[model samples]
Target: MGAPTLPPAWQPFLKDHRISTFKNWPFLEGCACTPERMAEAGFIHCPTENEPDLAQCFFCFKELEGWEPDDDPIEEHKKHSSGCAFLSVKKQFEELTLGEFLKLDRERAKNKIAKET
Candidate 1:
C-alpha cells in the first residue's frame, strides 16, 4: 500500500516524519564539506548560500556545521549522532530483520528518553 515493504535498516528512516525532512532538500554551497564527502556519509548540505556552512542528515535530523577540510563526513556524523541508524546500516544493523530492527529502535528511543528523565 505505502511503498510496499522496505528493508529493515531502512524502515527507521522511512517513517512519515523522517520522509518529510528530505523534501526541498539542501545544497552544498561554498563550504569545506564537499558534495562527494557529504554523500559518502548520507549528509545533505543545507541551503546555506545566504548562511554559513551547514549540513543535515538524510537518515537522521542531525545538523552539523563548522566543517573543516580535513573533516570526514562519516566521522563527524558518528561523533555527533552516534546512535544514528544510518551509521550502522551496513554494520551491526545489516543483518537484522524488519521486526528486530523495529524492536531495537524502540529500545533505543526508550533509553534516550530515560537519559533525558
Candidate 2:
C-alpha cells in the first residue's frame, strides 16, 4: 500500500502545484514565509483549523507548523528535516535527467515508507 507511483504529467513534480496549495494560506502579507518561498523549500500547505500554517514537504513529507513572520522556510526545513532529498535538489523537475529523476523518486519512496512505519 505504501508503494510509490509516478507522478502524472498533469501533476509534474514542480513547485507550482505545491505553491497552489497555499491559495488560502493565512499569512500572505509582511511574512518571510510566503507560498512561493515555502514551495521553493519543498513544502505544500496542509493546514488544519488549529494549525493554520502547517506545511508538509512534497518530497520528505516532513510536517512543520508554528510559523512566524520572520521564519525562513528553507532554513526551517533544514533545521527540522535535514535529511530530506528535495532540500538538496539543484535542478528543476524539467531539468532532471531520467536517471536523476528516478533516483529522487526512490528517495521520496523511502521517505514515504519511513513515514508509514
Candidate 3:
C-alpha cells in the first residue's frame, strides 16, 4: 500500500505545537515577547541562522524579525497583519464550534494562497 494520507486540516490548528516551536528560541526570561505571549499572539518561531528571533504567524503567515526587547507581540501582530482572522478571535480555541473553526480555517487558507502569489 501507499503511504497513509492525512486530511487537509490534519495539523496547523494546534496552539501547543506553535508554542513548542520556541523551545530553543534565543529570547526568553525578561524578554517582552516571550514564547507563551508569542504563541498567544498566533506566532510560531521560524528562526534562520542569521535571524534567530524570526517569527511567523500561524494563521496569517506573516513573518517578522528584528524584534525589540519591549515589542508587544499582539500589537506588532496587528500592525503587521491587520486582517489576520486569528487576531480578532475573542474566544478560546477549545471553545470554538465546528462552524467557527471551519471559518477560521478558510481564512487561513486564503491568507496562505495570497502569500504564495
Candidate 4:
C-alpha cells in the first residue's frame, strides 16, 4: 500500500561480515569503518610490549578510554572496536564473527522486506 523505505544511514552496514569486536563483540562492519572508533572501544587492546587488556579484541585494535559512539543500539553495532561503554554490547555479544553476525543482520533485514510483499 506504500513505497518501500531504505535501511537508512546504516543499512548497507548490516550486510557486512561480523568481525571480532572486543570480547567477542561486534563494533563496525562496513564502508563506515574507522580507526579512531576502533582505538577507543577496547575492541582492540594496545600492543604493549608485555601488558594488554585481557579482553582486548585485536580483529580491529580498538581501545577503551573516553569513548562514545553515536548510534541506535537496536539498529547499529554496539561498539567500533570504538569506545568503552559499548551499549550495543547487549545485542552484539552473541555475534562471534563478522560473517556470522552480518549473515543474521542481513537475513533479518531481508525478512522484513518479505514480510511486506
All candidates' lDDT scores?
0.56, 0.73, 0.74, 0.34
Alpha-carbon lDDT of model 3: 0.74
Models ranked on lDDT: 3, 2, 1, 4
Stretches off by above 4 angstroms in model 2 are 1-12
Encode model 4's per-residue lDDT on 4-103: one tens digit a residue.
3445533323212112223322334542223334433323333344433222332222233322344332222233422222323434434556565555
In model 1, residue pairs whose N, Cα or C atoms come closer than 3 Å (at least 3 residues apart or on different chains), thus clashing, are: none
Which ranges in model 1 have alpha carbons more than 4 Å from their true place? 1-32, 91-117
Residues 2-117, candidate 2, lDDT per residue (tens digit)? 32354563252666776777877766779888888778888887887787668777667778888878888888888877645667677876676878766766777787798779
Note each model's CA RMSD in angstroms: 6.3, 5.5, 4.8, 16.1
- After the best TM-score superposition of candidate 2, give how far the Cα of residue 9 lies from its true spot, in angstroms: 7.7
Candidate 2 local lDDT, residue 53: 68
In model 4, how large is the Cα lDDT of residue 50?
A: 48
Better of 1 and 2 by TM-score: 2
Shift in Å, residue 78, candidate 4: 27
lDDT of candidate model 4 versus the reference: 0.34
Query: Could you give me the TM-score of model 3 versus the true structure?
Result: 0.81
